[PDB]
Design a protein around this nucleic acid. Structure first.
Lengths: 915, 329
DNA sequence: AGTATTGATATAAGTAATAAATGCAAATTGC
DNA sequence: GCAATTTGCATTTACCGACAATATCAATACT
RNA sequence: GUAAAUG
């Protein structure tokens, strides 16, 4: 049955609404079935199999897998009950004095509430699931994650009942609970086995422990493997019934739960976090505080509107891709069917090295083809299963703010074919605006976006017979569609235009294609508004203009001139590359540059986008680096205000990383005068999202567990910050936060208007009918966002938040200005009896502000009479200019670079803002 | 006699690669007197000596000046040290050979298809009177090369198929402590049990008298090492230097199974035998509890066991039918 | 005093070490 | 103050030469 | 660790 075809066949809006409601109600149950966790189904199945075996009365080893798992569950439940009883006897005692007991109760409170019955299911299922998951077959996994995976599984299991109504468990507690549960399972994991005694040469019948703990040496390190019995391996290999507890992530069928809190929102029976916080407690704490206060409600609204777009799968494109799929030949995007990895001939030393290179290249090609084919397998099975269904995508933000879909296998964030296999569920009246916009969409899909609007429409009109043929004969025809740059999207839109031309009146047509309104270098368009640079704005198509001035084309022209000069001076590689400078590669590099990309990443990108062009066939790195060395110079020489603003942000990041607290360091941190930096760059977006950079120095520490001491990195413990990473990460983090803010404001305004808005970061998608309204909304939201001085607001918020912070700086002691500080430390030295300590200096400085903290008059007057080492530095206007001996310096943040004179109301009338 | 490298000559050198040596003829002749090598070798003049990592070569010069063997070979790769050796031993019966003893391909190439050195072959009845090797592996970086060199005796895949040959082994003193420890001592490990199984040792020298507390007191009483001043190793940064004298002995067991049992038992070298046996395989603990007769052994520590008891454990492991494949790797 | 905690060294043994080569030099911290 | 040393925007998927390493033991910090 | 995808 085809729900999409039925809904299309219904012409009336009222019956369409009734159909949508009926399908929502009908698919509620299907969604619940799809999201059910296999913690009860596996137990019921095992009990059913055991009952069937008991009733039948005949022993069958092949079917005995579930019966054996039931036996393990029975032998393991009372022992976990005993451990829980030990817990509840231990913690509940009134006296809280430790009497030298040999027990640990940190995990006890962890597994106190419910961890009695559903647990052995998780341990059995996970330990069996990791058959050779960690390349431990030489069977078995690594205990390091085996204990944590059980803890992680319990984590999700505990949240399962909470959502049915201790935010984050430490990795130490996770490992502890996992190890105790696995050891308990190991005790009662018995299985029948037969072996031959060399004394008798006859089969010997008995029992053996199913899972035996052991340690394995690899290059000089104990690994702590957790092996599995060979008979069990044999039995599990045949059945191939994983029955995993946690179902995978698939596109929803019911309208997703709107975001309300930082913790609830999205899937109807699963926990999802508003931030993709990998592992950090500070981000979670600040996000929770922001949620409780209520200062990201507009972010909630933006995510709601971005996620409330219903989709479906494009049947015709699905049929075409399925046909080429079953053909399985070497095709443009899908790799094809490969049989075997051909072995290069093995020589019986230069020849040997050439053979080694060939072997490595062939193995790499094998791995790449296999990975691509497996992905394509999963994507196409999902599409095949989801034909004629409503596909709601609930979205989610990473820590910076950019919105992502929750389902990671089938989404419009994927490649070209994945995007093409998707169309809007809704249909809306196309009209003249829709016709023009959809023709423009195909024109820019073919890569001809750098040309004006009328020229694009003329191009689409011109290749009318080409569209007709490419849609009439998808294969073995002219195959003009493959000549494009976005093949499957081009195929879908061509299909639609061919049908339109076959229709007498284009106005009556009902459209489903998503029309692409993207932007060129959103990062540059945000530097332009931040710095007020008129030259940048007129370079990046921000000011109104008759024709769009493409930034990638401009930088390509500049690098072409540069390499022409290089060819004149005599570089052979420049001479070769004189005529083959590509907008694609220069675009990718320029676009990534604003994202704080590194040199290695950029040269990898140029090599990646140069290899298909085959300027150099295999050694793509050697030419890519040579291109980068000139391309970065060109970009930097063209862009000035952007560079100044990012330099200010990076310098501020450094001066924040090297900071020192006041209250925290008042208590001795046990390192004496040598301090421990513990402050991270933190600010609020215009929307209000607290953006805490997570970079820190994490070092692993062995945690005691019953099985062994697992060597894990505990993020929950306080660690120092990584100054290098934070400085390198501040500018792109800020810019991406601004992009996300613009994205979410635009989405909220579009939802208020009543549109369908699906967006991939900067690029925005809507039906061809409402492109005009979406463009107006885009421009209005951008100007509203950047009508105020965000960089100045950021600097004053840094000053407000980091007011009472003391940097560390090593000025020369011989400087005549040292006299006051020398006197202060000398009196402290007399009181201390030795050299003055930085901890005592911080304590005295805090005492100075402590007196001023109390509004009481005598507290203020004496506080005004107090003299500290820092107060000496408060008199210099330019401390950085003044700046050996280490001494306390107050936190000084440089003033914002000068702002230009730019007008967002002027940019508003630029049709080529987002083409 | 050959020209011994002088202290002034060794002073000019810069790249020792982390190898500590000695430059004392008095200390070396005292060491030789303690060794009393002529007792085992009835006819020393037919000895063939194959020196590994000669480095400075002073030890080799002393050895040759004292005994005057028949054939003498030195194996090295380091560029500066090879330059020194080649520049110092032109025309001498010292055979200066450039190969890296870290690779068994070097031995496999040197043994027969090139006939670089011809080791006279002997049976396992008596320690060889012809072939001999002296190795200086004081470089702390390459110390497991010793473990490979020592398991080679058991596998018999190295030259040790040629009979029973001594290999005097200059070792970092901490490695000597690890090898030479006795049961109940902190430094006993797989090195110690492999040593007890495949050879016997006599400590012959040590730099710092302070670390002698680490060794066994009774062993020191039996040995009486030739102690020398710690101001005699040219790189003063490195740790003190010890010497060991290993003589392979006849043994009766299966090397691979013995390696499996000992290696997987010495990981838990403090938890007694009542619990550590589980690590060998499934049901190993319960089976070996059922079968082991000497109930004192059941509580003796894995660091308190000796090679004889480990051989007993290997025999029981072989008698065990459910024995998982030792090529589990 | 006396347990408790943290830092260091070994473990296997062919994913070697030494120093000789290279890099992206620039932003970083070694001392 | 110098000097040599370490490594870099966000997310997602699949794969394998292969990944967060573990056990004493001593030196010292806690009630 | 490697490879691919997306902005």
């Amino acid at each position: 049955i085809n729900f999409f075809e039925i809904y299309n066949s219904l012409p009336t809006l009222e019956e369409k609404k009734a159909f949508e409601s009926a399908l929502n109600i009908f698919n509620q149950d299907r969604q619940k079935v799809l999201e059910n966790r296999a913690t009860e189904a596996a137990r019921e199945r095992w009990k059913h199999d055991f009952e069937e075996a008991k009733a039948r009365g005949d022993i069958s080893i092949e079917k005995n897998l579930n019966v054996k798992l039931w036996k393990w569950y029975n032998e393991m439940l009372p022992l976990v009950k005993e451990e829980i009883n030990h817990c509840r006897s231990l913690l509940s005692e009134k006296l809280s004095d430790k009497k030298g007991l040999n027990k640990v109760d940190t995990n006890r409170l962890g597994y106190g509430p419910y961890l009695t019955l559903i647990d052995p299911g998780k341990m059995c299922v996970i330990t069996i699931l990791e058959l050779l998951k960690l390349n431990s077959t030489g069977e078995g996994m690594r205990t390091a994650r085996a204990v944590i995976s059980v803890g992680k599984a319990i984590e999700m299991e505990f949240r399962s009942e909470q959502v049915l109504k201790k935010i984050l468990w430490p990795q130490s507690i996770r490992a502890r609970i996992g190890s105790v549960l696995i050891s308990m399972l190991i005790q009662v994991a018995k299985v029948s086995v037969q072996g031959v005694d060399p004394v008798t040469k006859a089969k010997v019948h008995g029992e053996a422990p199913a899972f035996a703990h052991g340690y394995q040496y690899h290059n000089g390190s104990k690994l702590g493997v957790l092996k599995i019995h060979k008979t069990l391996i044999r039995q599990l290999n045949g059945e191939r019934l994983i029955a995993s507890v946690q179902p995978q992530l698939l596109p929803m069928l019911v309208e997703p739960k709107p975001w309300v809190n930082w913790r609830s929102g999205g899937y109807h029976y699963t926990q999802s976090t508003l931030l993709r916080t990998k592992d950090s407690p500070e981000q979670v704490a600040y996000l929770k505080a922001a949620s409780d206060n209520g200062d990201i409600d507009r972010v909630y609204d933006g995510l709601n509107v971005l996620g409330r777009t219903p989709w479906t799968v494009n049947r015709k494109v699905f049929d075409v891709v399925s046909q080429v799929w079953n053909k399985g030949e070497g095709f443009l995007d899908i790799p094809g069917a490969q049989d075997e990895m051909v072995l290069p001939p093995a020589p019986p030393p230069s020849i040997l090295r050439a053979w080694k290179l060939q072997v490595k290249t062939i193995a790499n090609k094998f791995s790449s083809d296999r990975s691509n084919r497996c992905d394509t397998n999963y994507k196409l099975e999902i599409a095949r299963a989801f034909l004629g269904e409503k596909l709601y995508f609930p979205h989610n933000l990473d820590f910076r703010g950019r919105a992502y879909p929750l389902s990671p296998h089938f989404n419009h964030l994927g490649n070209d074919m994945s995007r093409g296999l998707l169309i809007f569920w809704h249909g809306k009246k196309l009209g003249p605006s829709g016709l023009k916009w959809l023709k423009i969409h195909l024109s820019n899909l073919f890569g001809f976006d750098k040309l004006p609007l009328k020229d694009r429409v003329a191009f689409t009109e011109s290749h009318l017979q080409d569209i007709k043929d490419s849609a009439e004969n998808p294969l073995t025809g002219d195959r003009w569609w493959t000549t494009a740059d976005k093949p499957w999207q081009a195929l879908a839109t061509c299909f639609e235009l061919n049908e339109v031309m076959k229709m007498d009146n284009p106005e009556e047509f009902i459209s489903h294609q998503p029309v692409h309104q993207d932007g060129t270098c959103n990062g540059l368009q945000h530097y332009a508004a931040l710095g007020g640079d008129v030259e940048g704005a007129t370079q990046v198509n921000l000011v109104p203009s008759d024709k769009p001035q493409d930034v990638y084309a401009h930088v390509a022209r500049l690098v072409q001139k540069r390499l022409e000069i290089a060819a004149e001076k005599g570089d052979e590689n420049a001479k070769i590359l004189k005529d083959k400078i590509t907008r694609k590669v220069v675009k990718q590099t320029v676009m990534t540059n604003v994202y704080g990309v590194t040199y290695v990443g950029a040269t990898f990108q140029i090599a990646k986008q140069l290899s298909p062009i085959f300027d150099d066939r295999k050694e793509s790195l050697d030419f890519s680096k040579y291109l980068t060395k000139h391309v970065f110079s060109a970009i930097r020489e063209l862009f000035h205000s952007a560079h100044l603003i990012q330099d200010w942000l990076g310098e501020s990041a450094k001066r924040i990383s090297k900071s020192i607290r006041l209250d925290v360091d008042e208590k001795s941190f046990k390192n004496g005068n040598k301090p421990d930096f513990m402050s991270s760059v933190i600010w609020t977006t215009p929307l209000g999202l607290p953006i805490v950079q997570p970079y820190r120095e994490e070092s692993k520490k062995q945690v005691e567990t019953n099985l062994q001491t697992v060597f894990i990195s505990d993020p929950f413990a306080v660690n120092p910050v990584n100054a290098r990473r934070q400085k390198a990460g501040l500018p792109p983090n800020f810019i991406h936060s601004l992009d996300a803010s613009h994205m979410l404001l635009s989405a909220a305004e579009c939802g208020k208007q009543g549109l369908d808005f699906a967006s991939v970061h900067d690029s925005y998608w809507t039906h061809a009918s409402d492109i005009d309204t979406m463009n107006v909304v885009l421009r209005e939201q951008f100007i509203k966002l950047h009508e105020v001085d965000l960089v100045l607001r950021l600097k004053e918020e840094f000053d407000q938040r980091y007011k009472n912070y003391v940097k560390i700086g090593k000025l020369k002691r011989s400087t005549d200005l040292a006299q006051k500080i020398i006197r202060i430390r000398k009196d402290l030295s007399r009181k201390l009896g030795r050299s003055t300590t930085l901890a005592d200096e911080i304590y005295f400085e805090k005492k100075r502000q402590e007196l001023l903290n109390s509004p009481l008059i005598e507290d203020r007057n004496v506080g005004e009479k107090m003299v500290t080492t820092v107060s000496l530095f408060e008199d210099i206007t330019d401390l950085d200019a003044l700046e050996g001996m280490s001494v306390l310096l107050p936190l000084r943040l440089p003033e914002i670079p000068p702002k230009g004179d730019f007008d967002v109301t002027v940019l508003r009338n630029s049709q080529y803002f987002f083409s | 006699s050959v020209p011994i490298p002088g202290i002034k000559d060794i002073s000019k050198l810069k790249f020792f690669y982390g190898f500590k040596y000695l430059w004392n003829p008095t200390v070396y002749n005292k060491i030789f007197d303690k060794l009393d090598l002529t007792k085992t070798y009835k006819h020393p003049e037919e000895l063939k000596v194959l020196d590994l990592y000669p480095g400075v070569g002073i030890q080799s010069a002393i050895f040759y000046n004292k005994y005057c063997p028949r054939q003498y070979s030195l194996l090295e790769k380091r560029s500066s040290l090879y330059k020194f050796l080649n520049a110092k031993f032109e025309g001498s019966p010292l055979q200066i050979l450039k190969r890296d003893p870290y690779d068994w391909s070097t031995y496999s190439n040197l043994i027969d298809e090139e006939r670089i050195f011809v080791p006279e072959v002997q049976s396992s009845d008596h320690i060889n009177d012809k072939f001999l090797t002296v190795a200086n592996v004081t470089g702390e970086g390459s110390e497991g090369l010793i473990m490979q060199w020592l398991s080679c005796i058991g596998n018999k895949n190295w030259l040790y198929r040629f009979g029973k040959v001594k290999m005097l082994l200059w070792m970092p003193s901490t490695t000597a402590r690890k090898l030479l420890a006795r049961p109940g001592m902190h430094s006993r490990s797989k090195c110690s049990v492999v040593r007890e199984a495949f050879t016997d040792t006599k400590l012959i020298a040590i730099s710092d008298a302070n670390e002698l507390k680490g060794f066994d007191s009774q062993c020191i009483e039996e040995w009486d090492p030739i102690l020398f001043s710690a101001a005699e190793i040219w790189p003063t940064k490195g740790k003190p230097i010890a010497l060991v004298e290993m003589d392979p002995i006849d043994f009766d067991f299966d090397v691979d199974n013995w390696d499996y049992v000992t290696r997987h038992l010495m990981i838990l070298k403090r938890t007694p035998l009542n619990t550590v046996m589980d690590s060998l395989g499934h049901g190993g603990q319960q089976y070996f509890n059922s079968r082991i007769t000497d109930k004192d052994l059941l509580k003796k520590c894995p660091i308190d066991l000796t090679n004889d008891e480990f051989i007993y454990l290997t025999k029981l492991f072989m008698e065990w039918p459910f024995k998982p494949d030792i090529l589990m790797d």
